[PDB]
């Protein structure tokens, strides 16, 4: 019944049939993206209309199309031919990955480079990586991937231990031709293996860990209705899944007495970029837009009970489309569970004699994705006290290079001859806000120091100040950890019982933003990553901070274009875009497989409630 | 056997007997502090001499003494008379807190002030607070507490809901004299109650929370020997307890194959200050040194199984002295347990076909203290991967005032007429480092941005810079979140297999430090709180960042005086002092009892190991 229900296998098969009968899905076509469209703004929309957006690639070289389909009515709503030299290429297809290694395997320049290094071509794996936009004019309007080589000594070997440095190739994956092979010199291929399941490397496994058993003998405290609607401890929300963004949270609201109060209309990780900081020409082009170029949802893991998710777990198994329009189920792709989170509130009072302790809990909604060597977990948390938190967990295997004789200012040494280039992992959270409704505003809050003097004779006073962001041209903000800077999203038309506007406060981790030179290609294509906070006026088609077609787009799309409209955001329907990320100087302990590191943000109520919202939590 | 064992009841009784025999503990004497001294530097020199340090107060007004005794040999080692007007008063005694309300109940100035407000003296509670050092010359050399008043409507009422603003009194607790009563005008006493167990306020309790059962069917994975020596998942340490500092960690080490490798010799929270930012003369003197003035270990809670600590819990019950030298057990005052901590490492490799997931866990050592309206939890965490983390949890009831008509720049409104002054909670961690032994140094590490140009033609390169701190005069450092600043403690004489010095990296939360004006009394007394990081050369008598005697002591002691010696810290026995804190602008949701907020820091290995230290963790 809900317009926010997950796509079903039958809906995807119907989309396939509609495209096929319209002549839009011949043997030369590939679906590069397929997703449900959210309902348009309308708090009275009753007519059910399930619409899907599709990007259609053509392997023979014809121009791609963007198509919108109505599943409800069985019709094609619109079909537009795309000029990719202008607006960007379509996302990378899974089937184009293996093409890169196959094409190089018969190219005489590639084979010459391997022969000089005494490498068997059958043992050389090629990582197929997005191309970006640099100095090569012949690439404009063509689908390019670039390849970096790794040696796999045997089928179960970790090829990441054996980078082949000084060599890179560029490939047109539609015309199937190798455009350039660049060989800058011979580097020894690091020889130590990185096989973290080899007993020779692990040593004897520990026998000292005793079981931890986490059970819920009466079942979990949340309910799931209509497939993806969650009710838990006064929270209400819908769990969506999109092949580009992954898990998406809709209609986050809190039941305060008899009122269901909205907080966030839609929450997602709308882009993530991994720029590398090694100036070697072998890698200086390397920037992963994992969301926009690769689509993190289609690489979601199936999560195993007792290993990936521990406790009383409820799974969702979302459905996506393959390249031909067939539905594909990601079995156990989303984990949902509640967990204990320590003490919530505690006080032992001498005067009243009352001793009071209550425990906290959080609801967890998570998925894990694998893109090449990296693995990322995406975690959303809801807490009893109204706090909302996101956490990204980074693990997997670091991307490697040779470690140069004489050292490097831009590469860490992990093992003899083995390097790991410096890089960042930067995320953009898109928060379509709805604090008690859609009339919202953002204030920047700084601590204010005061000078000792009249009215402050002991020099102890301090204060704070709030600045309203009133137009998009002034809503591009930087962090300032030294002044305790936070941002408050409030509703100026909804007051608490003290006659103050209700609000939520965003707490950032204040990690460094994009480090690349402002004039670089990556600073232009990932402009969102250069600032901590952006606020835009809501619009239906402003979905991603990097624009719709990120792959090989020359730059400036997404947030810089949106902000340029300079719309009023003071008490309007607004969207907060928060940049946060990890700056990774790899350490020896990250090798041969990296322990998790984390980054995130949280939002806490700020006068949203009339008092603490967890006074009705029992003692148990 | 171990020199680091907890003080026993018998040792405390023996100290009492030794002091009595020496003529130092007659009926007019009180013990204000008693604690065991750590062994001096010298690997097992003293065979074992258990020594105790005692501060002895005299209720008749004679000068106090600092005494060191050997319980092993039954002797007083030294006894020194203290000149408290010069070097500071002793910590506040529990029995002095009761004196204040009773003395005020008979003072005609106090009664006249209450009669002016139509208040019944029998219902007025007085919060007795430390005095600090301000403009009152008659206080020098005297033990003073200051009192603020709150109305308790009935014996189970939360008096914090009913502050009596505009009124403060100062009391000499030795001569039993009210020195001053200051009345700046009548404020209405806020009338709403704050009784968070009253069903009228809580509403009906939730019935929705289902149980979460955490058990360990085979028992925990750690062992406890010698009363307080812990071994868990390659970690080794001793858990101490001091009445001033609370839980102290000694001899933190990691078993790396065959070798027990030291990391931290002694870790503690060596001071904590809570400065208030309201310039009203009723409260502009208000600063709590909870550790230095009150002694946080003395007020440790007994922790209840299932409420305070959940899971398979091992308890320690430390012994302290009462004011007469009798032993007092804090039953179940320390909780120890291990917790699941999600995914440790994960990778699904396309090329090798191997899927790999491992789970993390952490060892938790915690205690909770209650001082007046505030309750603080202190948590130390050890992780499988070598990470050490500290977390403070702040809860309890916020300190209140009237809310002025016309508002305030320094006070939050919580309820009609009820305010909460702005304040901070600032901690000092004292980390006596021993990274692979005692030859250590500290480097400051900043991210370095690079300009596009020769050798960085695409503008993507970034790097980092490390600066060795070589002398104490240059070892007073501030945070810089924007450049990703961290600090590395390394051993220049101990190298990993890549021939790089082994190290640990300190990651701060980069919260604001002390906000008070630099010329204020509190900035001079809490100078440590004005900077994020200090490094000193180890010395036996340099224990607290505020000095030995904080109560009513002007500046002149502690970290600024230590640093002036300008000692060599480049490859020496060094101590890291890290300042971290919360800046608290109270919100409506903090009333009537505050949900936990947290702050802390962590240390992560940085080339300490030759590869990931958790390759031998089994799959389970
Ligand atoms: Cu990384
Ligand atoms: Cu506070």
Quick structural gist:
Chains A, B: This is Phenylethylamine oxidase. The structure is a homodimer of 620-residue chains. By secondary structure, the first copy, chain A, is mainly beta.
Give an overview of the whole structure.
The PDB classes it as oxidoreductase. Keywords: TPQ, oxidoreductase. The assembly is dimeric. The structure is a homodimer of 620-residue chains. Chain A has 620 residues and is mainly β. Chain A has three domains: 1-87, Roll (Nuclear Transport Factor 2, Chain: A), CATH 3.10.450.40; 94-195, Nuclear Transport Factor 2, Chain: A (Roll); 196-619, Beta-galactosidase, Chain A, domain 5, CATH 2.70.98. Chain A is 9% helix and 41% strand. The first copy, chain A, contains eight helices and 34 strands. In chain A, the strands form six sheets. In chain A, strands 10, 11, 12, 13, 14, 15, 26, 29, 32 and 33 form a ten-stranded antiparallel β-sheet that branches. In chain A, a hairpin with a 2-residue loop joins β20 and β21 (374-383). The longest helix of chain A has 13 residues, at 9-21. The radius of gyration of chain A is 26 Å and the shape is globular. Chain A starts with 8 loop residues before the first helix and ends in a 15-residue tail after the last strand. Chains A and B meet through β9, β19, β20, β22 and β28 of A and β9, β19, β20, β22 and β28 of B. The structure holds copper (II) ion (2 copies). One copper (II) ion (CU) is lined by residues 394, 398, 423, 425, 584 of chain A.
């Amino acid at each position: 019944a809900s317009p926010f229900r997950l796509a079903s296998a039958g809906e995807i098969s119907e989309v396939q049939g509609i495209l096929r009968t319209a002549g839009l899905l011949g043997p030369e076509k590939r679906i590069a993206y397929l997703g449900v469209l959210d309902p348009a703004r309308g708090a009275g929309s009753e007519a059910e209309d399930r619409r899907f957006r599709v990007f259609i690639h053509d392997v023979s070289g014809a121009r791609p199309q963007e198509v919108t389909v109505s599943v409800t009515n069985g019709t094609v709503i619109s079909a537009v031919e795309l000029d990719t030299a202008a607006t960007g290429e379509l996302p990378v297809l899974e089937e184009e990955f293996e093409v890169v290694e196959q094409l190089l395997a018969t190219d005489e320049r590639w084979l010459k480079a391997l022969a000089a290094r005494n490498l068997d071509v059958s043992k050389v794996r090629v990582a197929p990586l997005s191309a970006g936009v640099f100095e090569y004019a012949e690439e404009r309007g063509r689908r390019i991937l670039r390849g970096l080589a790794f040696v796999q000594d045997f089928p179960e070997d970790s090829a990441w231990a054996h980078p082949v440095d000084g060599l890179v190739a560029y490939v047109d994956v539609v015309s199937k031709e190798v455009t350039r092979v660049i060989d800058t010199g011979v580097f020894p291929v690091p020889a130590e293996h990185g096989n973290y399941t080899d007993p020779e490397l692990t040593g004897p496994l520990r026998t000292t860990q005793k079981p931890i058993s986490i059970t819920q003998p009466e079942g979990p405290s949340f309910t799931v209705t209509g497939g993806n609607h969650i009710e838990w401890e006064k929270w209400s929300l819908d769990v969506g899944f999109d092949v580009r963004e992954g898990v998406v949270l809709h209609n986050i609201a809190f039941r305060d007495g008899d009122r269901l109060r909205p907080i966030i209309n839609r929450a997602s990780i709308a882009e993530m970029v991994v720029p590398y900081g090694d100036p070697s020409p072998i890698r200086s082009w390397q920037n992963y837009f994992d969301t926009g170029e690769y689509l993190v949802g289609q690489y979601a893991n199936s999560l195993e009970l007792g290993c990936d998710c521990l406790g009383d777990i409820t799974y969702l198994s979302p459905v996506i489309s393959d390249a031909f329009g067939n539905p594909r189920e990601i079995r156990n792709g989303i984990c949902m569970h509640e967990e204990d989170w320590g003490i919530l509130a505690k006080h032992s009072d001498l005067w009243s004699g009352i001793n009071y302790t209550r425990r906290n809990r959080r609801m967890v909604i998570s998925f894990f994705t694998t893109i090449g060597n990296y693995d990322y977990g995406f975690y959303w948390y809801l807490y009893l006290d109204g706090t909302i938190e996101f956490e990204a967990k980074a693990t997997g295997v670091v991307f490697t290079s040779a470690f140069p004789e004489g050292g490097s200012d831009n590469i860490s040494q992990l093992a003899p001859g083995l390097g790991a280039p410096f890089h960042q992992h930067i995320f953009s959270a898109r928060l379509d806000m709805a604090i008690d409704g859609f009339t919202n505003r953002v204030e920047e809050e700084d601590v204010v120091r005061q000078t000792m003097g009249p009215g402050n004779e002991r020099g102890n006073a301090f204060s704070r100040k709030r600045t309203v962001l009133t137009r998009e041209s002034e809503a591009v903000r930087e962090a300032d950890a030294r002044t305790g800077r936070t941002w408050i999203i409030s509703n100026p038309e909804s007051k608490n019982r003290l006659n103050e506007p209700v609000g939520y406060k965003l707490h950032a981790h204040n990690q460094p933003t994009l480090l690349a030179d402002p004039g670089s290609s990556i600073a232009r294509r990932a402009a969102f990553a250069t600032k901590d906070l952006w606020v835009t006026r809501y619009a239906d088609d402003e979905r991603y901070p990097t624009g719709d077609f990120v792959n090989q787009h020359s730059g400036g799309a997404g947030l810089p274009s949106y902000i340029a409209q300079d719309r009023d955001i003071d008490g309007q329907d607004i969207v907060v875009w928060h940049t946060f990320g990890l700056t990774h100087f790899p350490r020896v302990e990250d090798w041969p497989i990296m322990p998790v590191d984390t980054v995130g943000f949280k939002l806490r109520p700020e006068g949203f409630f009339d008092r603490s919202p967890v006074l009705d939590v029992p003692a148990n």
